[PDB]
Amino acid sequence: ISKLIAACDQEPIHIPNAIQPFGAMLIVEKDTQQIVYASANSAEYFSVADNTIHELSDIKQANINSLLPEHLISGLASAIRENEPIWVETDRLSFLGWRHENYYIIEVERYHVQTSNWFEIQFQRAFQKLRNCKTHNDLINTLTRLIQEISGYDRVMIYQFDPEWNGRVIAESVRQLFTSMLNHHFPASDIPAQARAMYSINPIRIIPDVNAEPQPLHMIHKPQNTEAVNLSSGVLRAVSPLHMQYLRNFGVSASTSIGIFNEDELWGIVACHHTKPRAIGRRIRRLLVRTVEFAAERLWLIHSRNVERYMVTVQAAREQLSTTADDKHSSHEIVIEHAADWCKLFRCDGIGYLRGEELTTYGETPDQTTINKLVEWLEENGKKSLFWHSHMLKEDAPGLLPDGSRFAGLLAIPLKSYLLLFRVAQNEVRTWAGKPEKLSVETSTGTMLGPRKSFEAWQDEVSGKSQPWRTAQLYAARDIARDLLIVADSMQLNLLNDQLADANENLEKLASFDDLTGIFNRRRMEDRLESEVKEAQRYKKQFGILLFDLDKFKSVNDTYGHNIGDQILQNTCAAVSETLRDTDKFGRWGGEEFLIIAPQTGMPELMQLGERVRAAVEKMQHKDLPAVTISIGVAEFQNDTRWDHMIDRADKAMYRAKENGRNQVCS
Amino acid sequence: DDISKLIAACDQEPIHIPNAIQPFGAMLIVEKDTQQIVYASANSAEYFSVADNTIHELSDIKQANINSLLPEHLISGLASAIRENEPIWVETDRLSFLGWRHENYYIIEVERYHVQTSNWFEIQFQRAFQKLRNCKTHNDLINTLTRLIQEISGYDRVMIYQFDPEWNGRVIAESVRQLFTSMLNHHFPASDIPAQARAMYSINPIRIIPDVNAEPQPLHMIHKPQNTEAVNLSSGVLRAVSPLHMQYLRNFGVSASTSIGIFNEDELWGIVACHHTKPRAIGRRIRRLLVRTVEFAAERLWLIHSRNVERYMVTVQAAREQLSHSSHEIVIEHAADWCKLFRCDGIGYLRGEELTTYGETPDQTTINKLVEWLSLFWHSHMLKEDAPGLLPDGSRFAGLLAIPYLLLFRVAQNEVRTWAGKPEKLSVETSTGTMLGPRKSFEAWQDEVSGKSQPWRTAQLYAARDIARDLLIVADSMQLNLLNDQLADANENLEKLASFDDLTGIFNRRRMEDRLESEVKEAQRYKKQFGILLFDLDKFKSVNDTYGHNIGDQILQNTCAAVSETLRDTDKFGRWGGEEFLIIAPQTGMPELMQLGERVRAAVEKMQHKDLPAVTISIGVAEFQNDTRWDHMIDRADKAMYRAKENGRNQVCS
Ligand SMILES: *C/C=C1/C(=C/c2[nH]c(/C=C3[NH+]=C(/C=C4\NC(=O)C(C=C)=C4C)C(C)=C\3CCC(=O)O)c(CCC(=O)O)c2C)NC(=O)[C@H]1C
Ligand SMILES: *C/C=C1/C(=C/c2[nH]c(/C=C3[NH+]=C(/C=C4\NC(=O)C(C=C)=C4C)C(C)=C\3CCC(=O)O)c(CCC(=O)O)c2C)NC(=O)[C@H]1C
Ligand SMILES: Nc1nc2c(ncn2[C@@H]2O[C@H](COP(=O)(O)OP(=O)(O)OP(=O)(O)O)[C@@H](O)[C@H]2O)c(=O)[nH]1
Ligand SMILES: Nc1nc2c(ncn2[C@@H]2O[C@H](COP(=O)(O)OP(=O)(O)OP(=O)(O)O)[C@@H](O)[C@H]2O)c(=O)[nH]1
Ligand SMILES: [Cl-]
Ligand SMILES: [Cl-]
Ligand SMILES: [Mg+2]
Ligand SMILES: [Mg+2]
């Protein structure tokens, strides 16, 4: 069927070599100055200008300077730019002429001087009423009422195009005979691209009678070129018979349409229908078009304002995000508090926020698993786009949602994880003015799609689509998302200061204490002993060291076990630690041997301390554990150079204790 | 003070009720319920004599009937109209009537008219709309508007006059045909158009003065009215002009003028002012042409402005995109673009104690006085007035935008304004009292404004907020990276401490115990083969006592480095206690285990002395023989090692 629809582009509507009979036309060669073509009814129009003209053939012996007003000839001689029509009227005739390539085209219509202030009053009323429209709907509806009152046509409709060139009636004024066509959808094939390009050449098209026989152009003088002359810039250009039969099927006897332009883009048309033939003069034409231009600018102003108003609204919501942010709320608390507002702001059914492994959801959302399938596919899709968005997910990302999913729209903002905005598919029921009909029709250009027969309402539905994401919403969603990224970063700065604090604290704990025992490791004993020697050498202080070791401990390991032995080491440190004085430092020196540094202690008290420790390890509680004894060497600071000599004395003393029976204390 | 009172007195004159009209028409005032004519302009008789033969003098209108003076269509229209101040236009062959309802009255203006037939107006409408539609920038629109208004109106001088927020004005466009002096970019004072005068444009968008020297015609009473309060004439075109404004135009060198209000919705944005050097009337149709043109051009200009905003937001989005290096690196890299984006001379970014500056800025200390002295943003275009004593005395800065810091600075622009005439304090006696008179000279006089900058457009505030928060994200990312680094090192050091001997660098005893237990479990599940090597340093105490602990520790480190080169990659090497070390050898039978023990024993033997004593180790060896606990293996290997030391040290034993 696609080939039939595409075939419409064969018919050359700019060169039909015929006109509608509500006027007449001449075609003049610029250099030759001769009339080379004239419409078949030229005689009944120019006989007003020249009495001699009775038949068409008389125009062959006629001169243009007898048929055209001096102002029109002067105007054509003067114009440099092409296709800029000149309007010159006389007492009984209204002339419209322009230059095109090597030809001058001149249309003539019957004209009656009508004097009134009607047009000016209507223009003032139209501008005042359009100026008072402040919303989209008001403008288009006021436009339809104004066009109906000005033109008198029984049905006026604003017909907006889709990006695919299909259309919808978005405003309508309908009287007693016509049926209402509001919100009905029409297919692209109704207006081929060639036909749409006409409005850019002449903004108004007029068909005063669908059944009026077209008047062909007859040759009069042999042109130099002979190729058909382009008639696009005028108003008399004959209508394709396909579109006439189209209008008949629509129940329309006469129509007029005006293109709606946004700069150079064709945004829609004002379509007017009547149940009987209906001519409109040049002044009512100019009124209609001037009105439509003003209304159009007004509508673009409303559109460009609602963009700025929406921006202000987004700024307001983002301002609300940071009123909660100072109160130290989490980002998940913020999403739950404001997500209902965002759904209105973004015209979406649901929101999901993912940061790390945690997920916050509001409204209609896929499951956490499906959300993660989405996120991962978003990463592996790898688009560098600041956001990713689709109103038909099943087509853009197949196999991604579950079987039967209702979601169609997704807007995803990547952060450093993701912000997701979900839109349920809206199952819009569309009412078309007639089914699409595969009807072939042969024409002088070839075979093409024929005009449909029925215009009665027919509904169809489109599934798997949502509303499209307007660009203003993409930027708002991204900015909201980044306002969340700022919240999370601060909370994580607090968390990371906490965790780094704990890490450094535990690191300090491990830098100074043996893991199994809990007392000071060997490096810390080495440090304390060296500084104790330095102090004792400067100020002649008195201190001693106790270097003890566990007796036959291998027998404990092999007879009992390593676990029992380790509890014995812990028991021995627990028993020794309560014995010690507050100034003394106690540490694990190597393996099973331990060190005690006793400052401010002379030799008798030092030996006594060794006795308290040795007796302390004996009495400590077994709790079903083997009996254990320690052997203590003892040394005192005797004007030593290095602490190594002191540990040497204590070590020799301790091994001397081992030989005299493993329980004694020796120095 | 003295002149402020004079200017304020201008608002005393009730210009809506002058009880007189300009003489380019005539006016009747009729009571609705009484149906009688109660007021008639003093020249009414030369107009209504067209309708009625009997009317020769003004006094005759008292015995006339309205239904003899007015067209039937105008009477029907007035009877039908409910809305007030909505004029009706009804014309005949010789007269053009404009009448409206106001409270209990009908007001009717009549002007001389003759039917002209042409397509000229329609062609002018088309050409004007096409030319305005082709304007895509602000300047193009206003200049095209000035050319169109001058060509349509024929006035010798046309100018677009834009108002300030304080009601002063400036000429922003001009088209001159004659020997007028140009008034482009000249400033005019508010008193030139009092508020009462500006409010007129909201009732009738066009004001017409066809002759500044035309004698005004007062209204004469005709039938005794019921109310007697002066009737409001604002909706029409015949309302007489204040003689102060007539004298103003004379001093301005203007014989006739026409002005059209320019409306942005309901706000008066400016006027189209037209002047002629000779008297000049314009018919109703040229009036309607001028006004429709001005409204169309106005809508077009508001659309151009709304698109520049939408476009500037696209620009801001582009710069923010380019933003997404340190945050200070980004500020230095991108601040030149931001100065264009924000129309500012300088930027300062403060983060903690560190300050990055670009362009014209105060010093760090003054910036700190600013921060300390300091809503989502705070902004002012007159710093000297809004925050005295804050800057140095001679400081050139006048504009400040502060985003919580991000600082945007605007140098004071010493804008020289050219005014049309010196200020002139002249008193003038008036029916309301004494008020300011129009100045006599309009010649150029200059003044200068210091201590002010451009005002901060709303779009720039929001842009500054968005840029600032995009920078905060950068700094947060950099500092999150730094803190993740510091936490990484802190946690990894914990591994090194919980797993390795500090002095040696190999595994501590806890990790060796764990590995031994898991190796035993593996061997018990899968019937694998592994063994342990437990060695000790010989006569090491002699090293400590003869040499030192520092030498002893370097010997332990040397010995671990020498042993570690011997081991295979699967083997684990750790410090068991003191000088006793352990090797875990998986996938190793007893002979290969003994061989490895020999390689280790020889490794410690030959290693480098470096002026240090020679060292030997004695190694015990054990093999996994279906043991229950690893203690049994360490026990066997320990006994073997003890057998090696007594039978002569530096040996391998199993
Ligand atoms: C294969 C060719 C096809 C075709 C040709 C065709 N159609 C036109 C002109 C028009 N069609 C219009 C369509 C509508 N009128 C409405 O009122 C609505 C909806 C409410 C629609 C969709 C309109 C508006 C025009 C312009 C003329 C007019 O004002 O009616 C042309 C151009 C004819 C001409 O004037 O040169 C052509 C060639 N139409 C098809 O359906 C197929 C068969
Ligand atoms: C104490 C009262 C004062 C006063 C009164 C006054 N002025 C007007 C009318 C107008 N003044 C206008 C000013 C300008 N015309 C220009 O062409 C320019 C420059 C581009 C300026 C500033 C305009 C435009 C009007 C409107 C009438 C007109 O178009 O000429 C009125 C109102 C008069 C009336 O409409 O009845 C009044 C009461 N002017 C002062 O200077 C002081 C003395
Ligand atoms: N369970 C356990 N055993 C350890 C620990 N540190 C060292 N050992 C054991 O200590 C033993 C070496 O201690 P030695 O002093 O040489 O031998 P001993 O049995 O105490 O003999 P004498 O001191 O001469 O009475 C080895 O078998 C090590 O396994 C430890 O933290 N836990
Ligand atoms: N410098 C230093 N010495 C240590 C360290 N750990 C243990 N020691 C020394 O180890 C020595 C005791 O080791 P032993 O095995 O009992 O004595 P030995 O001389 O090696 O005996 P044999 O092995 O039979 O030759 C003490 O002098 C401790 O100071 C350490 O980290 N650094
Ligand atoms: Cl036309
Ligand atoms: Cl008027
Ligand atoms: Mg021991
Ligand atoms: Mg040893």
Q: How far is B431 from chain A (nearest CA, A)?
A: 37
Sheet holding B397-403, edge to edge: B354-359, B346-351, B406-411, B397-403, B378-380
Backbone angles phi and psi of A98, in degrees to 5: -150, 165
In chain A, residues with a C-beta closer than 8 Å to the C-beta of B288 are: 120, 123-124
CATH class for the domain made up of A18-110: alpha beta
**φ and ψ at residue B266, rounded to 5 degrees:** -105, 5
| CB burial readout B270-285, b (16+ within 10 A) else e | bbbbbbbbeebebebb
In Å, how far from its chain's centre is CA B317?
Answer: 12
- CA atoms of B293 and B121, how far apart (whole Å): 11
Contact, A577 vs A518, CB < 8 A?
no
CA torsion through residues A229, A234, A235, A240, sign = positive
Tokens of B566: 């011997």
Distances (CA, A) of B587 to A62, A565, B529, B638: 120, 29, 5, 21
| CATH class of the domain at A522-660 | alpha beta
In which residue are the tokens 């322009």 written? A98
Tokens of residue B584, six digits: 């875990």
Burial string for A330-365 (b: 16+ CB within 10 Å, else e) reads: bbbebbbebbeebbebbebbbbbbbbeeebbbbbeb
To 10 degrees, the CA torsion angle through A559, A564, A566, A570? -130
Q: C-alpha B401: how far from its chain's center?
A: 11
What angle is formed at CA A200 by the lines to CA A199 and CA A202, rounded to 5 degrees?
Answer: 60
Which neighbouring-strand residues pair with B256? B276
Which residue intervals of B207-326 are DSSP H helices?
Answer: 243-251, 284-323
Task: Please tell me the residue having the least CA distance from ligand 4 atom 26.
Answer: B541
| A184-186 and A429-433 strand pairing | parallel
Asked if residue A355 belongs to a known ligand binding site, the reply is no
CATH number of B509-647: 3.30.70.270
List, in sequence order, every beta strand (DSSP E) within B404-519. Answer: 406-411, 415-420, 427-430, 433-436, 444-449
**Distance, CA of B219 to CA of B107 (rounded, Å):** 12
User: B20-112 with B509-647: one CATH topology?
Assistant: no
Q: Is B197 exposed, middle or buried (0-12, 13-18, 19+ CB in 10 A)?
A: middle
Q: Which two tokens mark A158?
A: 């604003």
* CA–CA separation, A659 and B492 (whole Å): 45
CA of B292 to the centre of ligand 6 (A): 13
Q: How far is A166 from chain B (nearest CA, A)?
A: 27
Structure tokens at B279: 């008297």
Residues facing residue A448 across a β-bridge: A441
CATH architecture for segment(s) B20-112:
2-Layer Sandwich (3.30)
Annotation-wise, does B278 bind a ligand? no
Q: How many residues does chain B have?
A: 654
Cβ count within 10 A of residue B224: 9
User: Which residues are A595's β-sheet partners?
Assistant: A547, A587
- Coil vs helix vs strand at B228: coil
- Residue pair A610/A581 in contact (Cβ under 8 Å)? The answer is no
Which atom number of ligand 4 is nearest to the Cα of residue B544?
27
Task: Tally DSSP H helices, then E strands, for chain B.
Answer: 18, 27
Q: Burial, A127: exposed, middle or buried (Cβ in 10 Å; 0-12, 13-18, 19+)?
A: buried
Nearest residue of chain A to residue B545 (CA atoms): A648
Q: In angstroms, rounded to a whole number, what is the distance separating the alpha carbons of residues B545 and B554?
A: 15
Look at residue A548 and give its three-state secondary structure. strand
Single-letter amino acid, residue A446:
G
Q: CA-CA distance, A5 to A2, in Å (whole number)?
A: 5
Contact assessment for residue A154 and residue A251, using Cβ atoms and an 8 Å cutoff: no
Q: Distance (Å, rounded) from C-alpha B447 to C-alpha B28?
A: 49
- The structure tokens 């206003």 sit at B142
Asked whether the beta carbons of A198 and A232 are under 8 A apart, the reply is: yes
Out of B292, B299, B483, closest to residue A298 by CB: B299
CA dist A278 and A352 (Å) reads 59
**Contact status, residue B572 vs residue B515, Cβ threshold 8 Å:** yes
> Is residue A488 helix, strand or coil?
helix
Give the position of tokens 């078309």: A432
Which residue has tokens 């014209």?
B360
Ligand 5 centre to CA of A280 (Å) is 9
H helix or E strand, kind and range, residue B590? helix B590-606
B457: left (phi over 0), alpha (psi -120 to 50) or beta: beta
Q: Counting beta carbons within 10 angstroms of the beta carbon of residue B533, is it exposed (0 to 12), middle (13 to 18) or buried (19 or more)?
A: buried
B178 and B276 Cβ atoms separated by less than 8 Å: no
CB-CB under 8 Å, A298 with B302: no
Element of type H or E holding A460: strand A457-461
Nearest to B349 by CA among B399, B402, B395: B402
The CB density around residue A16, as the number of other CB atoms within 10 Å, is: 18
Nearest to A122 by CA among A293, A297, A295, A288: A288
Sequence-distant (6+) residues with CB within 8 A of B477 are A416, A489
Resolution to one decimal, Å: 2.8
Q: Relative to the alpha carbon of A162, which ligand is closest?
A: 1
CA dist B84 and B74 (Å) reads 15
DSSP state of B202: G
Residue B502 and residue A19: Cα distance in Å, rounded?
A: 105
Left if phi > 0, otherwise alpha if psi is -120 to 50, otherwise beta: which for A639?
Answer: left
Q: Report the alpha-carbon distance of residue B160 to residue B143 in Å, rounded.
A: 9
Torsion of CA A68, A69, A72, A78, to 10 degrees: 100
The set of residues, in sequence order, having a beta carbon less than 8 Å from that of B525 and lying 6+ positions away, is none
What separation in Å is there between the alpha carbon of A235 and the centre of ligand 5?
6
Burial tier of B465 (Cβ tally within 10 Å: 0-12, 13-18, 19+): buried
Q: Give the pairing of strands B217-221 and B20-21.
A: antiparallel
- At residue B547's C-alpha, the angle toward residues B543 and B548, to 5°, is 90
Q: What is the dihedral of CA B183, B184, B186, B187, to 10 degrees?
A: 110
Nearest atom in ligand 1 to the alpha carbon of residue A9 is 1
Helix (H) or strand (E) holding A146: helix A136-151
Backbone dihedral angles phi then psi of residue B439, each to the nearest 5 degrees: -65, 155
In 3D, which of A252, A256, A260, A259 has the Cα closest to residue A235? A256
> Could A489 and B476 be called an inter-chain contact, meaning their C-beta atoms sit closer than 8 Å?
yes
Please state, in angstroms and rounded to a whole number, the distance separating the CA atoms of residues B26 and B20.
10
- Residues 6 or more apart whose CB falls under 8 angstroms from that of A107 comprise A19, A23, A24, A25, A95, A96, A97, A234, A235, A236
Q: How far apart are CA B313 and CA B306, in angstroms?
A: 11
Which amino acid, residue B89? W
Contact B451, B385 (CB under 8 A): yes
Strand ranges for B224-294 from DSSP E: 256-264, 267-276
Q: Give the position of tokens 């100074």.
A: A512
Contact (CB, 8 A) for B235 and B205: no
Pairing label, strands A440-443, A429-433: unpaired
Three-state DSSP class for residue B470 = helix
Tokens encoding B297? 């051009």
Distance from C-alpha of B498 to C-alpha of B506, rounded to nearest angstrom: 11
